[PDB]
Swiss-Prot record, chains A, B, C, D, E, F, G, H:
It comes from Themiste dyscrita. Hemerythrin is a respiratory protein in blood cells of certain marine worms. The oxygen-binding site in each chain contains two iron atoms. Pfam families: Hemerythrin. Fe cation 2 binds at residues 58, 73, 77, 101, 106. SUPFAM superfamilies: Hemerythrin-like (SSF47188). This is Hemerythrin. It comes from the Eukaryota. One of its GO terms (molecular function) is iron ion binding. Homooctamer. PANTHER family: BACTERIOHEMERYTHRIN.
């Protein structure tokens, strides 16, 4: 278990060293913070758009080097989209999910893509 | 039921806030107006090309954020192409179809893609 | 000296056979049509954006084949941008300008770019 | 004169309806937030990179439609780059600058680019 | 039956009005002329590369507007590649094939893509 | 001093091993061939377009690797554009020019760009 | 059997005449040399990334001209990735594999793509 | 003052964490290695091409985030191009130059571009 930032914002400990990836991640932190402030459709739309987009871009980056962990990673992503598409308002889950995802799954592709 | 513009041209009430989308939509209004002036092959070709192109671009935009309503939207598009490919000269149908499509189906992706 | 379409909308007599160019032209016609219905800011912004975008894209297209008539063409474009930036509500001027510009200046690059 | 969000993070009141622009803005907010926590080099590099990248992309976007307010806008951007290149630790200035810049200068191009 | 140019070179009667397409077609005329001069591997390689490339690009152009005749056209292309991949030295067939293909199959997509 | 192919068409002795470059060259040969059959405007426009496009693309290619012989090369190109812009019907000049240009100036960048 | 360079580095005998391909190949020689110096995860990651990327790019190049040997070539590539993904430390195999691959399989696409 | 790798090949101590940059650097190392084996034209062309291409790409990368140290960096690059354009066979200079350039000038932009 990694610490959950408060305020729930990206910090340099999340750096992957892929600047486009890092810049997209900042948008996912932000989407989750807005929902924590107000659980509404606008905020969910914002997060869901940024998530969908980030997951696809990152997947494309993985495929460009035929990354061996692509299948498993894509599955993790798809499971989170499902959660956003069946949103129940569990912001705590989302806060945790994103921190652990970056620091354990994204961190495993560093130097391989 | 939304009002059918006369002359059958795009107005700012159709704005989606995606400038490329709006610019493509203007070409679909125009294609339908020409057919209303003269139901010939040139006019149908023009509309059919612009429709095919717009539908594909918009679909690509939807996919870039893994838009959850993609499947349903694509199906709506494909049904209209079919109509254009089996054209019977029913310009009234087309005039209605396009107004309702933009204002109810396209308007639902705003803020999500 | 060419006729002014009424309603003020693109027709196949304006085809340049550059589909990209034709599709952008359809947006300039629409832009002038809106102004002709309501001379306001939303409508002028719409024409202005489309005009600026079309003129630059067309200019790029000319540059790609090192078109001999570029400088003269670009000077024509810049003059019209200038009129839009100092709009005076002279919708008749604009209806006229566009019709002649396409049918005389743009028709000139066909087959050369 | 606009309120400063606390915590210093992007919110939907800043939406420009250009998703690319909004997503880059989220990175400038985060950049200023880091500096507000720790005024060090890692944090300033992060803000500086994101700022330089966003300003140039936004500038390109303005240029694509030959935006009339470009020169004034670019001069605003260049002044802020300059402050970052001679950073003085004035985090309050930066919090302020960004908020007003978006809500006044960037809001101005909406519908024109 | 259309006349077979002699020398076997592209002329403006083959124009499709798509400059990229026309420029690629010129390379197919050339590939067939070389083979007519000397039926060797170099010449076949040249034609086969240019054919493969042209067919794919043109197919991509067709798909961008969801051209209704794509399937039939692609099949015609694939049948010619097969011939090149099982080359028997029948230059007369190839000379005929290309003239008839452009003037009857390619000419049918004009204004639709 | 190189032989002039008859018929005036590209052959593999002109290969530069840059497939893009070779394919554009084939269009310049064809352009000169048309003029050699009929010295008219359709034919000159065709050569002129292809020439302008090829020279700029090749120039870009040179620039991408910061080619040392660029300035000299570009000056050669610009002189020939100039002859085409003041065409005098001297088809012999053109047949000659192209053959030597490729086999001397273009052959020089091989392996350096 | 072709000679194995020592030091295990790319030389001009490996030239394919496709500069992007040659530049990528240099990265595969380097990846294998590092492993020969120290069989660790960093070195394997480096080679595996460069291999995955090169194989995909080259495959894309093959497909752009509908290269007839694509299937067989892709299979050869996939078999090598498998080896890297089940790495047993047999650097000798890898040194041999790459030399023979370039000089017999890659060399067969020259002039065809 | 950094050690010179022997054999003169890239190693992970040179990583900048910009995979594109690292992969281009590997080509400069190889270029200098060839010259170190045979001081001829094929080898110098190879280094020169790769150097020109890498320096411009890296320069573009710097420009994309409006890097503060660009002008100083570009001046360093241009000096080395100049040495290659007036090659004197001083391979020791080159081995040295590259090692220090990366480890001092290039290492400086990390995290800022």
């Amino acid at each position: 278990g990694f610490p959950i930032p408060d305020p729930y914002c990206w910090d340099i400990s999340f750096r992957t060293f892929y600047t486009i990836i890092d810049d997209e991640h900042k948008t996912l932190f932000n989407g989750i913070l807005l929902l924590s402030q107000a659980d509404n459709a606008d905020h969910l739309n914002e997060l869901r758009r940024c998530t969908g987009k980030h997951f696809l871009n990152e997947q494309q980056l993985m495929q460009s080097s035929q990354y061996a962990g692509y299948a498993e990673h894509k599955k993790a992503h798809d499971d989170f989209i499902h959660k956003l598409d069946t949103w129940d308002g569990d912001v705590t889950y989302a806060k945790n999910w994103l921190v652990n995802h970056i620091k354990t799954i994204d961190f495993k592709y560093r130097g391989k893509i």
